[PDB]
Amino acid sequence: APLKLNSRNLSQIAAAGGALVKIPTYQRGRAVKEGIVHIGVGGFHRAHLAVYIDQLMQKHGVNDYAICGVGLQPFDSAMRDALASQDHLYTLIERSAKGSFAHVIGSINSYLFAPDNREAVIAKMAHPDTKIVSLTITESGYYYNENTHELQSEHPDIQFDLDPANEKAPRTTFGFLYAGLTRRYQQGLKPFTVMSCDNMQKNGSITRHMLESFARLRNPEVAEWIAEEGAFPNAMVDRITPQTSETDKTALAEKFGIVDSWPVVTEPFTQWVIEDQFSDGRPPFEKVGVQVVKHAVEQFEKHKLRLLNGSHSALGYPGQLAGFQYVHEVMANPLFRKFVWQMMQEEVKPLLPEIPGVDIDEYCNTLIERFTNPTIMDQLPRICLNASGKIPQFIMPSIAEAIWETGPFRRLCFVAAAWFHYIKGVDDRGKPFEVVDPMREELQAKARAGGNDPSELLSIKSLFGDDLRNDERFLREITTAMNDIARDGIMKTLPKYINGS
Ligand SMILES: NC(=O)C1=CN([C@@H]2O[C@H](COP(=O)(O)OP(=O)(O)OC[C@H]3O[C@@H](n4cnc5c(N)ncnc54)[C@H](O)[C@@H]3O)[C@H](O)[C@H]2O)C=CC1
Residue 174 CB neighbour total at 10 angstroms: 26
Residue nearest to atom 33 of ligand 1 (CA): 137
Ligand 1 geometric centre to CA of 187 (Å):
32
Preceding residues of all breaks in the chain (C to N beyond 2.5 angstroms)?
294
Q: Which atom of ligand 1 is nearest to the CA of 172?
A: 30
At 154 the three-state DSSP class reads coil
Q: Which atom of ligand 1 is nearest to the CA of 199?
A: 41
- List all residues 6 or more positions away from 383 whose beta carbon is below 8 Å from its beta carbon: 312, 313, 315, 316, 319, 327
Rg of the Cα atoms in the chain: 24
Q: Of 72, 48, 38, 44, which Cα lies nearest the Cα of 143?
A: 72
Interhelix angle 396-405/410-422, rounded to 10 degrees, is 140
**Rounded to a whole number, what is the largest CA-CA distance in the chain?**
69
Query: Tell me, what amino acid is at 250?
Result: T
* Residues 325 and 289 reside in one and the same domain: no
Q: Are 394 and 310 in contact (CB under 8 A)?
A: yes
Separation between Cα atoms, residue 410 and residue 481, nearest integer Å: 8
Q: Which domain holds residue 329?
A: 294-501
User: Which residue among 37, 38, 41, 44 has the greatest number of ligand 1 atoms within 8 angstroms of its CB, and so is best to mutate?
Assistant: 44
Ligand 1 geometric centre to CA of 393 (Å):
17
At 4 the three-state DSSP class reads strand
Separation between Cα atoms, residue 185 and residue 179, nearest integer Å: 10
* Residues 251 and 356 reside in one and the same domain: no
Interhelix angle 310-322/334-342, rounded to 10 degrees, is 150
Q: In the structure, which protein residues have their CB atom closer than 6 angstroms to any atom of ligand 1? A: 40-45, 71-73, 75-76, 136-138, 140-141, 173, 198-199, 237, 240-241
**Pairing, β 271-275 against β 291-293:** parallel
* Residues 103 and 202 reside in one and the same domain: yes
Residue nearest to atom 25 of ligand 1 (CA): 137
Categorise residue 18: left if φ over 0, alpha if ψ from -120 to 50, beta otherwise. Answer: left
Q: Are 371 and 331 in contact (CB under 8 A)?
A: yes
Q: Which atom of ligand 1 is nearest to the CA of 76?
A: 35
* Residues 204 and 301 reside in one and the same domain: no
* Residues 281 and 301 reside in one and the same domain: no
* Residues 211 and 335 reside in one and the same domain: no
Ligand 1 geometric centre to CA of 427 (Å):
29
Instruction: Give the resolution value in Å.
Output: 2.1
- Report DSSP letters for 393-406, one per residue: HHTHHHHHHHHHHT
* Residues 217 and 307 reside in one and the same domain: no
* Residues 451 and 351 reside in one and the same domain: yes
Residue nearest to atom 16 of ligand 1 (CA): 42
Residue 430 CB neighbour total at 10 angstroms: 7
Last residue of a domain, one of 293, 318, 341: 293
Ligand 1 geometric centre to CA of 484 (Å):
36
Helix locations, 163-308, DSSP H:
173-187, 203-216, 220-229, 246-256, 296-303
* Residues 286 and 357 reside in one and the same domain: no
Q: Are 452 and 482 in contact (CB under 8 A)?
A: yes
Separation between Cα atoms, residue 398 and residue 422, nearest integer Å: 20
Burial class (CB in 10 A: 0-12, 13-18, 19+), 396: buried
* Residues 77 and 122 reside in one and the same domain: yes
* Residues 376 and 360 reside in one and the same domain: yes
Q: Of 442, 482, 479, which Cα lies nearest the Cα of 460?
A: 442
Could you write out the three-class secondary structure of 251-285? HHHHHHCEECCCCEEECCCCEEEEECCCCCCCCCH
Last residue of a domain, one of 245, 269, 293: 293
Q: Which atom of ligand 1 is nearest to the CA of 140?
A: 29
CA angle centred on 445, ends 439 and 446, rounded to 5°: 90
Technique behind the model: X-ray
- List all residues 6 or more positions away from 462 whose beta carbon is below 8 Å from its beta carbon: none
Burial class (CB in 10 A: 0-12, 13-18, 19+), 90: buried
Separation between Cα atoms, residue 129 and residue 108, nearest integer Å: 15
* Residues 116 and 247 reside in one and the same domain: yes
Q: Could you give the number of structural domains in the chain?
A: 2
Last residue of a domain, one of 234, 268, 293: 293
